[PDB]
C-alpha cells in the first residue's frame, strides 16, 4: 500500500488553465458511454449485470473471462475407483468429498485441510491429503497413458525450533554462529 | 530621532522578513505536486537507468 508518504500523482489535462487546451478539446467530442447489460461467458449460468461501456462495444464480451481458467479434477463413479483408482483406507465417499473440496479451494492444500470435514470423516493431516492427491493423479495418468515424509519432518523441525523456550533460543543461536 | 527610527525600522524589517520566511515555509509544507501532464504520463517518460 504505502508507508505514509507523499500523495499519488495523477494524470491531468487542465494543468495550466483550459486556455491552452481550449482548442484541443473544442475540436473533438466524446464517444457516447452507456449503462449496458452484459453476461460474462465465464458464468456457467447466464446471468446479466450492468456496467458502464462505450455504446460501441455494447454486449461485445467480458475481457475478464480469460481469467476463468480452472484446474482439472479426476472422475470416477462406479468401477474406475475399483479397477484403476484403487483404495484400501479411503471410501469412495471420502475421496469424492476431498476432491470436490479441492476444487472448491482450487488445490490450495492448507485451507483444503482446514475445511476437510473432521466429523463426517476421520482426522488426518495436510500432507496425507497432498500425497493422496498425488497418488490419484498418478493413477489417472497411468489409466489414461518431493517426499511427504520429509515434509512432516519439516513441520516438526520448525515446531521444535520455534517452540524453543526464549533463553534456549538465544543460547543455541549463539552456539549456532560461533562454530 | 532619525537614529531611533532607523533602528526601529531595522527591527521591523527583520521581523517582517522572518514572518515572510515562516509563511514561505508553511507554503512549502503542502504537497506541491498532485498531478502531471498526459504526454508525460503515457509515453514512458524516463528509464531508471
UniProtKB/Swiss-Prot annotation, chain A:
Record localization: Nucleus; Cytoplasm
Domain SANT: 87-137
Subunit structure: Component of the NuA4 histone acetyltransferase complex which contains the catalytic subunit KAT5/TIP60 and the subunits EP400, TRRAP/PAF400, BRD8/SMAP, EPC1, DMAP1/DNMAP1, RUVBL1/TIP49, RUVBL2, ING3, actin, ACTL6A/BAF53A, MORF4L1/MRG15, MORF4L2/MRGX, MRGBP, YEATS4/GAS41, VPS72/YL1 and MEAF6. Component of a NuA4-related complex which contains EP400, TRRAP/PAF400, SRCAP, BRD8/SMAP, EPC1, DMAP1/DNMAP1, RUVBL1/TIP49, RUVBL2, actin, ACTL6A/BAF53A, VPS72 and YEATS4/GAS41. DMAP1 also forms a complex with DNMT1 and HDAC2.
Function: Involved in transcription repression and activation. Its interaction with HDAC2 may provide a mechanism for histone deacetylation in heterochromatin following replication of DNA at late firing origins. Can also repress transcription independently of histone deacetylase activity. May specifically potentiate DAXX-mediated repression of glucocorticoid receptor-dependent transcription. Component of the NuA4 histone acetyltransferase (HAT) complex which is involved in transcriptional activation of select genes principally by acetylation of nucleosomal histones H4 and H2A.
Protein's UniProt name: DNA methyltransferase 1-associated protein 1
From-to range in the entire protein, with total length: 63 to 251 of 467
UniProtKB/Swiss-Prot annotation, chain B:
Highest taxon of the lineage: Eukaryota
Tissue specificity of this protein: Ubiquitously expressed.
Localization of this protein: Nucleus
Subunit structure, as described in the record: Component of the NuA4 histone acetyltransferase complex which contains the catalytic subunit KAT5/TIP60 and the subunits EP400, TRRAP/PAF400, BRD8/SMAP, EPC1, DMAP1/DNMAP1, RUVBL1/TIP49, RUVBL2, ING3, actin, ACTL6A/BAF53A, MORF4L1/MRG15, MORF4L2/MRGX, MRGBP, YEATS4/GAS41, VPS72/YL1 and MEAF6. May also participate in the formation of NuA4 related complexes which lack the KAT5/TIP60 catalytic subunit, but which include the SWI/SNF related protein SRCAP. The NuA4 complex interacts with MYC and the adenovirus E1A protein. EP400 interacts with TRRAP, RUVBL1 and RUVBL2.
Family statement drawn from the similarity comment of this UniProt entry: Belongs to the SNF2/RAD54 helicase family. SWR1 subfamily.
Functional summary from the UniProt entry: Component of the NuA4 histone acetyltransferase complex which is involved in transcriptional activation of select genes principally by acetylation of nucleosomal histones H4 and H2A. This modification may both alter nucleosome - DNA interactions and promote interaction of the modified histones with other proteins which positively regulate transcription. May be required for transcriptional activation of E2F1 and MYC target genes during cellular proliferation.
Protein name as it appears in the record: E1A-binding protein p400
Classification lineage: Eukaryota, Metazoa, Chordata, Craniata, Vertebrata
Full-length numbering of the shown residues: 2188 to 2236 of 3159
